[PDB]
């Protein structure tokens, strides 16, 4: 009778935002008091749920999506947002029903000289649909001449790395984000509050 939120927040390694990981949360009771009483989070915002009813609501299934973005990009993880992350890496539906939790992880995801293990998608021909993951590393062919999978003129690699250094400003520091999605399907509720 408890949800395995520890497997998500206290994970050793987090995925890059372009390759965000999703863990299925089901057959348990979620206590949001534990989340607030877990760590010190810089961002904890909920959407689609009334503040009074959050502690007394049931949901069909819950998905926990986790990734790492820049500090000033956390504002893009919200319904009706636009930007590099929202359009090409991780898009939330305009009717999103769930909570977005984020916290600074500069002591974990920043290394001296720059931690180049986290990536983000630079551009995509079409904007991402809600809850769409694109891990393709095909070389974008901007010009008429084909690329043949080789970086060069008019042939750009679609992924770029974060320069996560401990000396960066707060807006450029690593932030771990967890997006809890609440599904209202006509099925027995596997996650409730009371």
């Amino acid at each position, epitope marked *: 009778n408890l949800c395995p939120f520890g497997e998500v927040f206290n994970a050793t390694r987090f995925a890059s935002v372009y390759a965000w990981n999703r863990k299925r949360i089901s057959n348990c009771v979620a206590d949001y008091s534990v989340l607030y009483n877990s760590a010190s989070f810089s961002t904890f915002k909920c959407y689609g749920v009334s503040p009074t009813k959050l502690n007394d609501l049931c949901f069909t299934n819950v998905y926990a999506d986790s990734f790492v973005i820049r500090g000033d990009e956390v504002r893009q993880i919200a319904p009706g947002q636009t930007g590099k992350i929202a359009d090409y890496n991780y898009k939330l539906p305009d009717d999103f029903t769930g909570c977005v939790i984020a916290w600074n992880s500069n002591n974990l995801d920043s290394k001296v000289g720059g931690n180049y293990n986290y990536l983000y998608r*630079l551009f995509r021909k079409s904007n991402l649909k809600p809850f769409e993951r694109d891990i393709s590393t095909e070389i974008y062919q901007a010009g*008429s001449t084909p690329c043949n999978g080789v970086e060069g*003129f008019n042939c750009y690699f679609p992924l770029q790395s974060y320069g996560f250094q401990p000396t960066n400003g707060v807006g450029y520091q690593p932030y771990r984000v967890v997006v809890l999605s609440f599904e209202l399907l006509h099925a027995p509720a596997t996650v409730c509050g009371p």
Partner: antibody
Amino acid sequence: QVQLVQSGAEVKKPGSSVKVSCKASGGTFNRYAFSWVRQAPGQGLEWMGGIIPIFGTANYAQKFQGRVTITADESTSTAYMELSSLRSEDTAVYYCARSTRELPEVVDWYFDLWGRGTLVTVSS
Amino acid sequence: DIVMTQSPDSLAVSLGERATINCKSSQSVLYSSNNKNYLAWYQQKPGQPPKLLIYWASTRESGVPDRFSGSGSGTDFTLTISSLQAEDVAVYYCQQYYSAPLTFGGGTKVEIKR
């Protein structure tokens, strides 16, 4: 409507570095291709390199490879050119030119809009 | 790289007479896949940036007057001004955008014979 504004003329001591700006005012900036074309006094046009800011990675001419660094700041719609290890031959006017098409379409690097030019003089 | 050679270096033409500028490329800029020539013509008045006149070796840019024409295919190309005007005295460059590095021609200065 759209115009490209470049930094003022500068004089640099030989062996130093110079950085010239190029601001695009009134249109899209990220999806275009911005190049830097050099013209020595009395000489022809010479392509130094270019960049599509949305991809962040620039492509240089082999002649200037290693000495020129072309970048762009998408939040200010400004493209930069930095030329290090300045020599007497580097005295020229530095133009910034924008491609005619945007990134969703096919970007062929022939340039429809130009900057008024920045003259960089290298002397002691 | 594809080096661009122009001929002549300079020519003098009376008002309203025909002006012809040549551009030769060391490698063919006619792409086999699309059957299009990746060649452009520019105009540079003194003290001013270059101005795009012709692209695809035959297509005029919007606003360019009808007296400017582009012809040629492969390695030999031609810029033609049917009747030269006083406001046309400039240096004309040809550019290839087939491959990197992008290379321009030596330029051709046209002046009015009056």
